[PDB]
Symmetry: C2
Subunit: 219 residues, 2 copies
C-alpha cells in the first residue's frame, strides 16, 4: 500500500455508489515535498479511458463503473509520482486489476435444432445423437459454466413420454425404452435443456428432432 | 507488499487445484537471518482451523478450500516473522480476507402458501394481498438477491387467466379485470414466482390462494 502492491481483484457487475475506492498507493517521498499521483494504461488514459482514476493528491485508485469479465478480464495500469517541481520521484509501479467472474450468462446450445435418426428396433441403450451447449462464464475457476443437460419433453408422447434419455454430462441422447413404431410415430421432437452450475443455475433450451426409421435403406 | 498490505478478496465457491496461492508477504530482516512465517487467527489456527496456511520459508499465503460468503464473509488473520534463533523480527501484521459473493442461493418465499381474499365486484386495480421472498446473497453490493415477482398461473382459469396481476417489485397482487363470480368460482389458486437478478436469475415458486366473497359479512 506504498509503491509495493499485490494484484487487486474486483468482481464484475458490481453495484453501489460509484466511484468506489479500490486500494490507495503512496510515496514515502511526500514528507520531503508535495507529490501528485497519476495512472496510465488501458482503462486509465488509453481506451477504455476512464474506468480507473487516481486522486492526484492522495493516491486513491478508484473504479468509476461496473466491470465485465467477458469484455476485459484483466487490466495493467502504471502509477507515477511527480513532485511539485515536475520531477519523477518514483518509478512507474505496475498495478494489475483482475476481474472475477459472476454467473450472468445463460448456457447456449451450439445449434437451434439438432437432428438425428434412430433405427426402429434399436436395443434400449443404443446411442442416438449428441447435443451441445457452451457458457461464456469462467470454467477455469468457478461453476458458473458447468453445464448439465436434461430432456424437458417429448412430442408425440406416444407410446409413452419417455422414449429417450440424455446423459446429464455428455449430452448424448440414448433410446431408453423399446417400442419405436415408424408407421405410427415417425418423428420425435424432444426439448433439451442446458443449465449451468451443474444443473442448478441459469438455463436454456433447444430442440432435438429424431427420425425413427427402418434402418435398411427403405426404398 | 512488504508488511503493509491491502485487504485481500477471494470469491466464494471457487474451484480448481487447491491450495491456491493467495498473496506472498515478505519481512525485511530476512537478509540478516533466515526468517520463518506463520499466521494465526480464526481460519488459521483457531476454528475454522486450516482454511488458510502460509509457507514458512516463503511467506506464501494460500487457501486450502472453497469458501462460502454465507458462513463466514470476512477473516482476520495475523502474520508473524521469526528469525532462525527464535526471535520475532517483525510485529504481527493484520491481514483481512474478504469473501466476495456468488449467485448460489435461490430466492425463497416467506410462506409456502400465502392466503387472501378479494370482494366480488372489487374495482379493477384494487389491491388484494402481498407475497414476499428473500434471497441469502449479497444485496449490499450485487444483484444476486434482487428479486422480481411474477404470476406463473391461475386456477381456475375462468373467467380467464388474467384475473389478477402482481407488481414486479413490491409483490402486491391486485385485481386486473372485472368478473369475479364467487358463486361458481369463489377460489383462485395463483402460482407466483420470485427470481433474483431482477427477474433474470435463479427462481422459486409458492402459491397464493385467493378467496372471493361477499364483502359485507354473509352469515
Ligand atoms: Ca458481464
Ligand atoms: Ca460472467
Ligand atoms: Ca453461466
Ligand atoms: Ca455459498
Ligand atoms: Ca452467495
Ligand atoms: Ca440469489
Amino acid at each position: 500500500m506504498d509503491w509495493v502492491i499485490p494484484p487487486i481483484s474486483c468482481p464484475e457487475n458490481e453495484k453501489g455508489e460509484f466511484p468506489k475506492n479500490l486500494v490507495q498507493i503512496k510515496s514515502n517521498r511526500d514528507k520531503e515535498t508535495k507529490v501528485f499521483y497519476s495512472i496510465t494504461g488501458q482503462g486509465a488514459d488509453k481506451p477504455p479511458v476512464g474506468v480507473f482514476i487516481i486522486e492526484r493528491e492522495t493516491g486513491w485508485l478508484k473504479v468509476t463503473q461496473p466491470l465485465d469479465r467477458e469484455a476485459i478480464a484483466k487490466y495493467i495500469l502504471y502509477s507515477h509520482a511527480v513532485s511539485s517541481n515536475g520531477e519523477a520521484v518514483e518509478d512507474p509501479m505496475e498495478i494489475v486489476i483482475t476481474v472475477t467472474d459472476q454467473n450472468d450468462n445463460r448456457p447456449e446450445f451450439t445449434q437451434e435444432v439438432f437432428e438425428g435418426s434412430v433405427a426402429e428396433g434399436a436395443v434400449p441403450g443404443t446411442s442416438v445423437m449428441k447435443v451441445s451447449a457452451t457458457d461464456a462464464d469462467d470454467d477455469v475457476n468457478t461453476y458458473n459454466a458447468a453445464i448439465a443437460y436434461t430432456i424437458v419433453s417429448q412430442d408425440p408422447e406416444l407410446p409413452h413420454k419417455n422414449m429417450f434419455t440424455v446423459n446429464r454430462d455428455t449430452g448424448v441422447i440414448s433410446v431408453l425404452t423399446s417400442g419405436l413404431d415408424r408407421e405410427s410415430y415417425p418423428t420425435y421432437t424432444l426439448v433439451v435443456q442446458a443449465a449451468d452450475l451443474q444443473g442448478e443455475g441459469l438455463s436454456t433450451t433447444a430442440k432435438a428432432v429424431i427420425t425413427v426409421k427402418d434402418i435398411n435403406d427403405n426404398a
